Design a protein around this ligand. Sequence first.
Ligand SMILES: C[C@H]1O[C@@H](O)[C@H](O)[C@@H](O)[C@H]1O
Ligand SMILES: C[C@H]1O[C@@H](O)[C@H](O)[C@@H](O)[C@H]1O
Lengths: 262, 249
Amino acid sequence: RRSHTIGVVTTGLSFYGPSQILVGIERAAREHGYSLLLATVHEDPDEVEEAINTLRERRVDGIIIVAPHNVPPVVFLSAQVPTVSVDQYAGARLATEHLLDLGHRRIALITGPQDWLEARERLQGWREALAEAGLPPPAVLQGDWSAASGYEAARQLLEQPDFTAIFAANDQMALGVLRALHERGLRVPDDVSVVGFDDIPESAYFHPPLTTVRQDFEELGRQAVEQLLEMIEGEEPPPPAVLPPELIVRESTAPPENLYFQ
Amino acid sequence: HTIGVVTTGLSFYGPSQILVGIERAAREHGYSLLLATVHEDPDEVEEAINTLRERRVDGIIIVAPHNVPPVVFTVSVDQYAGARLATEHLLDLGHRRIALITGPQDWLEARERLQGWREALAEAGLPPPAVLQGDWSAASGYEAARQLLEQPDFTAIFAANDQMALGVLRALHERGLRVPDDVSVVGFDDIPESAYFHPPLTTVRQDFEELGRQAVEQLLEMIEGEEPPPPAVLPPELIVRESTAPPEN
Ligand SMILES: C[C@H]1O[C@@H](O)[C@H](O)[C@@H](O)[C@H]1O
Ligand SMILES: C[C@H]1O[C@@H](O)[C@H](O)[C@@H](O)[C@H]1O
């Protein structure tokens, strides 16, 4: 009547965030005696629904969704119903308020793909920080979490440069931004300040070490397992969890040149 | 019904990309994927095999430090040939003092990349120097490089993976050493980031996703009664970017 297995539908496993979330889920599920059924969905319409009903056939005790989407109990790692997530909006606010506090006023944003709710939330936290400072929000370039998209977006921004700081919506894209800036001969942070998001292990060894917003991906996945176990069993009503984000100040930000003329 | 996989070091690109290829190869062939993770104790994999066996799994795939039918990592990439070509390239550029930052010696990739580097130098008549050991992480590459720079008796460093090579580049730039104008650096994997390092990293390409797909390909033949197939080997490729050059000695 029970399988002692947990189904998980995740995407973007080539990146650090979803992998470490998957690491947190596997370790917590195993420490409570649960095997893990892993399903990956691609950029395909409603492929998660196909994967959920596949897990349902495997008599799973519960399901954790780590992907954009929307009975065996289900837990989502977004908003939507039980949810476990990091305050993305407040994190982008910290990143943008960091730059504003240094004197930057023309702060570009390279965002993720809009089908990810985190990308929209980080966009709005950036916009609201500039609006509170009385600044109109510039035109936003869109990436896809890849370093290539960051590098390509930064080259577009450099065609007619009107910024002193770039907020890349994650660290992967920030690496490409750093690349494009070095190519053009621009120093970081002296000519252009760069802030990322995620705090992936590589970011501390970028050139220069990148200021970023830390997400605890592992604990995110463990808390998701804790929420799902409480619903599988003699409970169900869970606390909607919000994990706090943390700004990791390193070496890629500095007051702009011509500080008092910004 | 289902397929079992025991893997480790999922926070790295390589193991995660292999798992991606295993998942898609089983999703298209009607198999669900059971995931078991091991850490550093080698008595955890045999414990994780028996767990999937109790779950009545049709086949297991081992992607961790290894030795009804499991496919163990056979399917592989010629690690020895990969590091041998990288060392030969540096020698061809004129380097003669080529340091090696190896990986965890319990990993067969680490042991076999160190062998290809050693034997490439030995064929040339050169003596292999002392090796420093990392853990795949960017921190161990940075800390191993800083140790080398207490006595810079080299013009090139060969780090056993792109993660560690990023730490090496950081320790070199901190000490004001131009790359490759003063020190050449080579990695291994071709992670998506390495093309955007400062400078873009010369490295050896592994087809991780293909590696996982072949693991399921060989596994299904053992399940459907086609008997154990022969081992397969995927050739690695040397990708020469901007992090290598002849030395200025
Ligand atoms: C790929 C995608 O994965 C999530 O875990 C991260 O929060 C996000 O920044 C992005 O890196
Ligand atoms: C972390 C470890 O993962 C393996 O898949 C790679 O072959 C190796 O180079 C290293 O990256």
